[PDB]
Every structure is written in C-alpha cells, then in structure tokens.
Amino acid sequence: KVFGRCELAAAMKRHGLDNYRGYSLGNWVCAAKFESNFNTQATNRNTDGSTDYGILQINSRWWCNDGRTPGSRNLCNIPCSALLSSDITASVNCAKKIVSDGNGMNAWVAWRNRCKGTDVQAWIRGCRL
Ligand SMILES: [Cl-]
Ligand SMILES: [Cl-]
Ligand SMILES: [Cl-]
Ligand SMILES: [Cs+]
Ligand SMILES: [Cs+]
Ligand SMILES: [Cs+]
Ligand SMILES: [Cs+]
Ligand SMILES: [Cs+]
Ligand SMILES: [Cs+]
Ligand SMILES: [Cs+]
Ligand SMILES: [Cs+]
Ligand SMILES: [Cs+]
Ligand SMILES: [Cs+]
Ligand SMILES: [Cs+]
Ligand SMILES: [Cs+]
Ligand SMILES: [Cs+]
Ligand SMILES: [Cs+]
Ligand SMILES: [Cs+]
C-alpha cells in the first residue's frame, strides 16, 4: 500500500511513534518518505547482500528474517515479509527497537542525511491527526 502523508502520520500516531524516544512524528514521516516514498511494499537489496523492507526499510542483517542473509539475527523476531504488510504494526514495533539501539534515528542513514536538523514539522503540516 502507498500511504498518503497525513494518512501515514495518523497511523504512526495510532501506533505510538509520535515522540517515541523523543522523535516527533515529523521525523518518522520524513524518514518514511525518503526510505520508501510511503510504499509498504518497498524492498531494496544492500551491497552486503542483506535487504531492506517496508515503509522504513528495515534490514535483514539485524532485524528481520529473510532466509537469504548469512550471519543475521532477527532481533525483531519477525519474517521480513511481515514488514511489507498494509498494516504498519510490525514495521512500527520493529522501528521502536531500532531507534532504541543506541544511535537513535541515525540508524536510518537517509534520516541523518535528509531529515535530521530540517523542518520536519512540514511533514505533518495540515494533518488532522
Ligand atoms: Cl508527500
Ligand atoms: Cl539461514
Ligand atoms: Cl536520541
Ligand atoms: Cs509515544
Ligand atoms: Cs506526542
Ligand atoms: Cs532504489
Ligand atoms: Cs540497490
Ligand atoms: Cs538499500
Ligand atoms: Cs541502504
Ligand atoms: Cs534503503
Ligand atoms: Cs536464518
Ligand atoms: Cs540468520
Ligand atoms: Cs531472534
Ligand atoms: Cs514480533
Ligand atoms: Cs546496542
Ligand atoms: Cs548500536
Ligand atoms: Cs544502518
Ligand atoms: Cs539545518
């Protein structure tokens, strides 16, 4: 599913992302935009052979199981396919773990390069919420 921005913001809010570990909802929406363009079915293979899945491009090296990533851990205890669901619960639950791992949202390189320090509130501007 391709979410609308206000639509996604609300679903993130519904699932407790808003200001989770101190990251305003704008941050999570901005990260989603640049990771997946709000597409739950997004996949992208990494140079190291792992693959990133879903709205927030969660990687199969550490977080989810895909069966083809040697050395990986499945720390979210989830098949990577569950991260492509139209329901964002699994992605959200797994992102809470990631953002708690010690480096905050810097875990998402695109966040650091494209959202960090910017006017992230624009991403939720006008949204009912
Ligand atoms: Cl947009
Ligand atoms: Cl294996
Ligand atoms: Cl932090
Ligand atoms: Cs919260
Ligand atoms: Cs909040
Ligand atoms: Cs790409
Ligand atoms: Cs790629
Ligand atoms: Cs990637
Ligand atoms: Cs990547
Ligand atoms: Cs990515
Ligand atoms: Cs495995
Ligand atoms: Cs593994
Ligand atoms: Cs595990
Ligand atoms: Cs789980
Ligand atoms: Cs850690
Ligand atoms: Cs870490
Ligand atoms: Cs990373
Ligand atoms: Cs800035």
Side-chain angles (χ1 to χ4, degrees):
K1 164 165 179 205
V2 190
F3 276 85
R5 38 169 206 102
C6 290
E7 193 190 6
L8 180 62
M12 286 177 157
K13 190 165 173 203
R14 181 72 206 133
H15 293 83
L17 273 192
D18 57 309
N19 215 24
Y20 191 84
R21 294 292 270 218
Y23 291 93
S24 68
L25 193 55
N27 283 284
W28 295 109
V29 180
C30 183
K33 168 66 167 187
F34 295 130
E35 291 297 352
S36 64
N37 203 24
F38 308 147
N39 183 2
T40 66
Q41 303 195 266
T43 60
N44 292 282
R45 190 86 89 118
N46 298 317
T47 178
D48 72 0
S50 59
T51 300
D52 285 351
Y53 297 87
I55 198 102
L56 280 161
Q57 293 290 282
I58 291 168
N59 79 64
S60 61
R61 169 61 192 87
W62 294 105
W63 309 106
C64 64
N65 176 62
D66 70 4
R68 56 166 207 203
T69 307
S72 79
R73 293 293 303 276
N74 193 13
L75 293 182
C76 291
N77 300 101
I78 191 82
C80 298
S81 56
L83 305 177
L84 309 186
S85 168
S86 54
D87 180 322
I88 69 163
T89 305
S91 286
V92 172
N93 287 0
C94 186
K96 293 179 177 175
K97 285 193 146 283
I98 294 173
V99 73
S100 297
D101 198 46
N103 293 319
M105 284 201 73
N106 297 296
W108 288 274
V109 174
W111 181 79
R112 171 175 63 75
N113 289 326
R114 300 182 83 174
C115 300
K116 188 176 181 174
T118 69
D119 175 24
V120 285
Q121 194 277 342
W123 289 106
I124 55 165
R125 196 162 297 147
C127 305
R128 188 158 189 80
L129 291 180

